[PDB]
Design a protein around this nucleic acid. Structure first.
Lengths: 77, 116
RNA sequence: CUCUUAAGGUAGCCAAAUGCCUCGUCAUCUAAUUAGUGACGCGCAUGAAUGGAUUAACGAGAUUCCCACUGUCCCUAUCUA
RNA sequence: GAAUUUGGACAAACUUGGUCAUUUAGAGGAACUAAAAGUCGUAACAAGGUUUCCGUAGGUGAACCUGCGGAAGGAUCAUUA
RNA sequence: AGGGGAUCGAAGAUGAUCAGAUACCGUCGUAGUCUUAACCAUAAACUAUGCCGACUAGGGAUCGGGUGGUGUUUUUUUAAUGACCCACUCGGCACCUUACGAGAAAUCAAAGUCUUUGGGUUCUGGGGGGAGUAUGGUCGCAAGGCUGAAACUUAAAGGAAUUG
RNA sequence: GCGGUAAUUCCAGCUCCAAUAGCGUAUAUUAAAGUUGUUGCAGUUAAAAAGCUCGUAGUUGAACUUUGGGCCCGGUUGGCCGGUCCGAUUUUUUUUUCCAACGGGGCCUUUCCUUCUGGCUAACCUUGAGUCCUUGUGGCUCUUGGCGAACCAGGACUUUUACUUUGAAAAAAUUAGAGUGUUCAAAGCAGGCGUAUUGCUCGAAUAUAUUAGCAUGGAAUAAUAGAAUAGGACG
RNA sequence: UAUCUGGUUGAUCCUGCCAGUAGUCAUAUGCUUGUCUCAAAGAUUAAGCCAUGCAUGUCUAAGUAUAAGCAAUUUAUACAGUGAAACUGCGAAUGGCUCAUUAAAUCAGUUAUCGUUUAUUUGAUAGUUCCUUUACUACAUGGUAUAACUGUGGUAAUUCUAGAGCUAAUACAUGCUUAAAAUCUCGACCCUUUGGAAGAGAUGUAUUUAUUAGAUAAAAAAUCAAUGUCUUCGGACUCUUUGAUGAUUCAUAAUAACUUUUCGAAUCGCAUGGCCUUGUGCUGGCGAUGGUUCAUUCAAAUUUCUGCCCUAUCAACUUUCGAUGGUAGGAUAGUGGCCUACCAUGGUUUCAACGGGUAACGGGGAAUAAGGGUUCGAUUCCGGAGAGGGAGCCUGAGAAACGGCUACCACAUCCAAGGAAGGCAGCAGGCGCGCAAAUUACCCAAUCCUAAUUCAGGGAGGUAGUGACAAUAAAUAACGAUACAGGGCCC
């Protein structure tokens, strides 16, 4: 696919931790529900920047024990 | 979002458990209770152990002329009279309440039906 | 209610290293317990620095258990100076 | 291959101890509840016959009493209106 | 834990009082009451009423700022000013006295608004009891605090008002 | 709540009530229940403000930046058939006779829609030859110069979301619901004409597809970021 | 398909329950029980335990049958049609039963596999094998080895099984074939150099590496060292052109070499009339059993994205190597910590990690909704997972298998005491368990499935039995009548 998020954990030579940030609704009203799952970056080459900032990344092939999405281009800076 | 509260709860594990339409079980003793305040009478009930849980309970042979069972051996089926977490009851602390038996009761019947 | 001497055992505590009867009664540990331990109290005769009740740790202190270990023993036998 | 067998990786299961989660036995002990009342004493209500309740701290046959300091959810006995 | 230690005053004594007095009435008196370094973190810890902003209606009275200043004296030979002080304002305070509107009432300037959303949020309640008990974990020196059940057991307990 | 000799509640007869091939009784649950509450609760005494402030996570947070005026094509509800505004119909007559409102696209105004290379159409600037007829801007054959974004595709760049609009795609039965006399019904997905020696004939619909994904049209409400020692911004 | 009612008081208003009152997907039980059509059914209890009988096997040409001692008919002779049973080959990985675990990518919706296997139906193909250089165990066909069968035997007994003798094959081995040229590397000799040269060697496919080609967004030239094509011999190349997809090292094409070496047609059936030269040769005409490498759907596998009921008296979690990652390697059908090693500290969490609970299979959908919601889920259909517990395997295209083995733990049966067997959570049926769920029946007819060209098999499925088990209907009376009327109706 292709998604986004704000890079969470810098340190891990070739594997940014970037946080993507859902927001779900429900019945009872639905305004307050500020969910957020975190996923891993990548991984086989280099060239990039640090914590904060938002990069693209897009489903690599099962690149390492659950780290399945390499980083395309850095959208945020 | 938020917030779950009290009232009726999940945890269960009572004394007939099966929310049974009864509970088979042998007739331990024939203990005719005794009425509560206001009203007053010798409330003929029966104590018995529940084949299932074994657990022992005592309940009114409630009929009207039928300590016919009253077979220390013989085995009624008991069965609560939803109070629910309570007893009726002129009849002091009796939980469930006599059912059918020796397995087969109108409780009076076969042949005819007598009464009560 | 009483007769009564200063006062008439208070917290607390036990068959206890004090209890006569006592091998106390009920449990508990046993195949089995005049041992142990846990309980219970008109305790012969427990009790408040005569110190009362607790109590970590300490113990060549008294007891009873379990495990391991084993000639203690069943059942004695052989070897060395 | 069969025998047979060297080392391995899986890995049952055996033992012994650990750790969870779910039940459960017991001398006795101490509550409660059905409790309407039996018996002692009157705490609360009428400033309940010592106004009452709030902590907290002693002391008690039971209810309680008392000590500091609150609140009226009050005494209206009324220095103010 | 030390300092002191007037007063009163748990415990404790005795004096009356009672059928019964371990009290209530005397009177001694321990602790405590004060104090410093350290704990304890409860109260009818009250206004039994969460915090923020709105809007909804009148008058009076006591704290800072505006003006007219008038009122009597400072400053003095006098004015003025000055000091209080009077009158109209506003600010914000603590409170009082009466409509719409709210409520079960009582009452309420909110306890008001919205059919029965609606401005944003923190918190607690779900019949009585059994109980703020059982257990667990934590806090503490202790007393205790904080967290906190279920079994069972009852149909009423409970507010306000109205009359005996 | 009944029952303490005259029982409207027990017992039993008579009768009568209710539902009936079916009624109890147990036991859950769902409703009633706005007694668990977003809609939609309560909290001064009735259950319920924490003693007091601090303050992290969370949940929320003043208003300002594009309007307002003008032009152009639109069919669907409409006042009768209708491409239709001074009328072609719904009127009292021995002429004067009212047009609605709804939504959509495009373009004008100090107003780039991302795009340079340039790639088509059918639309316009408008005329080289012409025109129809109801009073020529009621109609369009026509190709000379010559519209922007439809629009394909390499090649150069893009600030990130919520929300809301149709849309696609993936299941049948389940349910909503068209169709048809299964004797009616529950169902079923059959069926229906006749003209009966190889005849004809319709079906087997639609609907809901809800969170996330994809694709879309929108720029109100709400975030996000940008030029401050200029390390702005073009060509 | 928007309703409330009765109980705290002397009477009264308010909270708040309690209790009636209705529908079940809630089963049970009590009585009662006429017909109709529709039929749920041992899951809750105990994935507790099972007597016995059943449940899976299949073949038209089909690879396999024989001269009177495999033989049921009867003449096709040098094996006839006929068959038993045996080898073959398929199948048993469907189904049907069950939800114990399970807080998960389970499952749902959406994703892709530039991250891989796939028997089988299907669409598609392949002249190069010995060549050692004509007298190549031969292509007019190449060894064998064996079941069944025969006799010879053993054991209580099982689908027991020895040893002896026979024979088969699409079985195991085996391993012949056919065209023509094309440029390649050898370079004998030419006895010229601006080079020329024969014949003799290599080839197909798969497999192993390792190399190059894969074009391209703009448009034009000088330069080596090597090396082609035409030439008017000075020079010139204007002579080509290559997909597909967003994204490639792709697919498919070569250059070197390479392997206990893959692949190519030994089988069989109709069908004996045509070409011309007399057994011949071509001809093999039609269909089918095949084998190679492509996708084809049947599928499998992993796989993104978002959703997972109570609980804080569960706040810190994960490292003895794996928990995050990096290399590199080992395995895999194949990604990857999947596993190894080496190296680095990482990854999650109050936005609820982790842990605990589930009388938890998920989702279809079920029940009572004015709406908003509660509550339910293992009957059917999808997806999962398991056949006593638990591992490990052979078989294969496909299984961690139930109706297959192997061992352990667990039950538990027949024994000549030696030893041998087993898995009803498939139908029936029993015990047990409990509140709680039927028959040891009939059948292939239907629907379909499995085996090869038939019509074989199938407690999949369908019929019956049992069963007011929830549902649709709906008789237990219909007439007027005669008179008695007690009288009510306009007085």
């Amino acid at each position: 696919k292709i998604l986004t998020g704000t890079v969470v954990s810098t340190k891990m030579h070739r594997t940014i931790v970037i946080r993507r940030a859902y927001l779900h609704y429900i019945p009872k009203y639905n305004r307050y529900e500020k969910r957020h799952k975190n996923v891993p970056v990548h991984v086989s080459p280099a060239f990039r920047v640090q914590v904060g900032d938002i990069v693209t990344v897009g489903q690599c092939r099962p690149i390492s024990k659950t780290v399945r999405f390499n980083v395309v281009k850095v959208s945020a800076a | 979002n938020n917030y779950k509260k009290r009232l009726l709860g999940t945890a269960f594990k009572s004394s007939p458990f099966g929310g049974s339409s009864h509970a088979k079980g042998i007739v331990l003793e024939k203990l005719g209770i005794e009425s509560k305040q206001p009203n007053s009478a010798i409330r003929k009930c029966v104590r018995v152990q529940l084949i299932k849980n074994g657990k022992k309970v005592t309940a009114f042979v409630p009929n009207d002329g039928c300590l016919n069972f009253v077979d220390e051996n013989d085995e009624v089926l008991l069965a609560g009279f939803g109070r629910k977490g309570k007893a009726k009851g002129d009849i002091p602390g009796v939980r469930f309440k006599v059912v059918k038996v020796s397995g087969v009761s109108l409780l009076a019947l076969w042949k005819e039906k007598k009464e009560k």
